[PDB]
Short mmCIF file of C-alpha atoms and ligand atoms in Angstrom, two decimals:
data_model
loop_
_atom_site.label_atom_id
_atom_site.label_comp_id
_atom_site.label_asym_id
_atom_site.label_seq_id
_atom_site.Cartn_x
_atom_site.Cartn_y
_atom_site.Cartn_z
CA UNK H 105 0.00 0.00 0.00
CA UNK H 106 1.59 3.24 -1.20
CA UNK H 107 -0.09 5.61 1.25
CA UNK H 108 0.32 9.34 0.59
CA UNK H 109 -0.10 11.41 3.75
CA UNK H 110 -0.64 15.02 2.70
CA UNK H 111 -1.34 18.26 4.56
CA UNK H 112 -0.86 21.75 3.17
CA UNK H 113 -0.07 24.47 5.70
CA UNK H 114 -0.21 28.21 4.81
CA UNK H 115 1.15 29.53 8.11
CA UNK H 116 3.22 32.62 8.86
CA UNK H 117 6.89 31.95 9.52
CA UNK H 118 10.31 33.54 9.18
CA UNK H 119 12.04 30.21 8.54
CA UNK H 120 10.92 26.85 7.20
CA UNK H 121 9.66 24.07 9.49
CA UNK H 122 8.52 26.41 12.29
CA UNK H 123 6.98 25.64 15.65
CA UNK H 124 3.44 24.33 15.87
CA UNK H 125 1.57 21.03 15.61
CA UNK H 126 -0.12 20.00 12.36
CA UNK H 127 -1.18 16.37 12.10
CA UNK H 128 -0.63 14.73 8.72
CA UNK H 129 -3.96 13.39 7.48
CA UNK H 130 -4.26 10.60 4.90
CA UNK H 131 -5.30 11.83 1.46
CA UNK H 132 -4.86 9.12 -1.20
CA UNK H 133 -4.23 5.38 -0.87
CA UNK H 134 -2.88 3.15 -3.65
CA UNK H 135 -3.55 -0.63 -3.50
CA UNK H 136 -0.81 -1.58 -5.98
CA UNK H 137 2.37 -3.41 -4.85
CA UNK H 138 5.55 -2.04 -6.50
CA UNK H 139 9.21 -2.32 -5.31
CA UNK H 140 10.23 1.34 -4.72
CA UNK H 141 13.94 0.98 -3.82
CA UNK H 142 14.90 4.38 -5.35
CA UNK H 143 13.33 7.81 -5.49
CA UNK H 144 13.53 11.13 -7.33
CA UNK H 145 11.32 14.22 -7.46
CA UNK H 146 9.91 15.24 -10.84
CA UNK H 147 10.63 18.97 -10.64
CA UNK H 148 9.32 20.62 -13.81
CA UNK H 149 9.75 24.15 -12.41
CA UNK H 150 10.16 25.79 -15.85
CA UNK H 151 9.35 29.15 -14.25
CA UNK H 152 12.21 28.91 -11.74
CA UNK H 153 14.25 31.52 -9.81
CA UNK S 60 -17.46 -16.92 -41.46
CA UNK S 61 -20.02 -18.55 -43.73
CA UNK S 62 -23.53 -19.59 -42.65
CA UNK S 63 -23.40 -22.90 -44.56
CA UNK S 64 -20.31 -24.03 -42.63
CA UNK S 65 -20.74 -26.76 -40.04
CA UNK S 66 -20.12 -26.63 -36.31
CA UNK S 67 -16.44 -27.39 -36.89
CA UNK S 68 -16.14 -24.39 -39.22
CA UNK S 69 -18.62 -22.16 -37.36
CA UNK S 70 -17.23 -19.30 -35.24
CA UNK S 71 -16.94 -20.18 -31.54
CA UNK S 72 -15.98 -17.03 -29.64
CA UNK S 73 -13.24 -17.42 -27.01
CA UNK S 74 -12.88 -14.78 -24.28
CA UNK S 75 -10.13 -15.51 -21.75
CA UNK S 76 -10.72 -14.79 -18.06
CA UNK S 77 -7.70 -15.24 -15.77
CA UNK S 78 -8.08 -14.12 -12.15
CA UNK S 79 -4.61 -13.22 -10.89
CA UNK S 80 -3.69 -14.10 -7.30
CA UNK S 81 -1.11 -11.33 -6.98
CA UNK S 82 -0.25 -9.37 -3.80
CA UNK S 83 -2.59 -6.38 -4.19
CA UNK S 84 -6.24 -7.47 -4.53
CA UNK S 85 -9.24 -5.70 -6.04
CA UNK S 86 -12.68 -5.05 -4.50
CA UNK S 87 -14.39 -7.44 -7.00
CA UNK S 88 -17.12 -8.10 -4.34
CA UNK S 89 -25.66 -4.66 1.23
CA UNK S 90 -28.81 -4.53 3.45
CA UNK S 91 -30.73 -1.38 4.48
CA UNK S 92 -30.70 0.38 7.85
CA UNK S 93 -32.41 0.52 11.24
CA UNK S 94 -32.74 3.57 13.49
CA UNK S 95 -32.85 2.65 17.20
CA UNK S 96 -33.02 -0.96 18.42
CA UNK S 97 -30.63 -3.78 19.23
CA UNK S 98 -29.34 -5.30 15.97
CA UNK S 99 -26.24 -6.94 14.55
CA UNK S 100 -24.26 -4.70 12.21
CA UNK S 101 -21.73 -5.73 9.53
CA UNK S 102 -21.15 -2.06 8.67
CA UNK S 103 -18.10 -2.19 6.30
CA UNK S 104 -17.05 -5.68 7.50
C1 NAG O 276 7.34 -6.08 -4.94
O1 NAG O 276 6.27 -5.65 -4.10
C2 NAG O 276 5.20 -6.61 -3.98
C3 NAG O 276 4.15 -5.96 -3.10
O2 NAG O 276 4.67 -5.65 -1.81
C4 NAG O 276 5.75 -7.90 -3.38
O3 NAG O 276 4.69 -8.85 -3.27
C5 NAG O 276 6.83 -8.45 -4.29
O4 NAG O 276 7.39 -9.64 -3.76
C6 NAG O 276 7.94 -7.41 -4.49
N1 NAG O 276 8.91 -7.92 -5.44
C7 NAG O 276 10.17 -8.19 -5.10
C8 NAG O 276 10.63 -9.59 -5.35
O5 NAG O 276 10.90 -7.34 -4.61
#
């Protein structure tokens, strides 16, 4: 089960990963068994700076 | 595919069904409701 636990948080902060509790709720579950032994992020920023 | 052909030459459709017993299964598988009284529930298993 590839479970994706997602939670967006638009909170005020001067630096990333600030103080405060925000539980990660489950969003999408995938009932497909695949061997994920490696990982990369598809980052098609295009408009990047 | 002629109508005059016999059973040996007549089209016999073949559609394969193969249920796979792999690791991740599918949901290939409901009463009504009561309001207030003692019953047995199988709500979602
Ligand atoms: C890949 O993942 C599936 C699901 O967890 C598992 O059944 C299978 O054995 C894995 N394959 C191998 C041999 O790594």
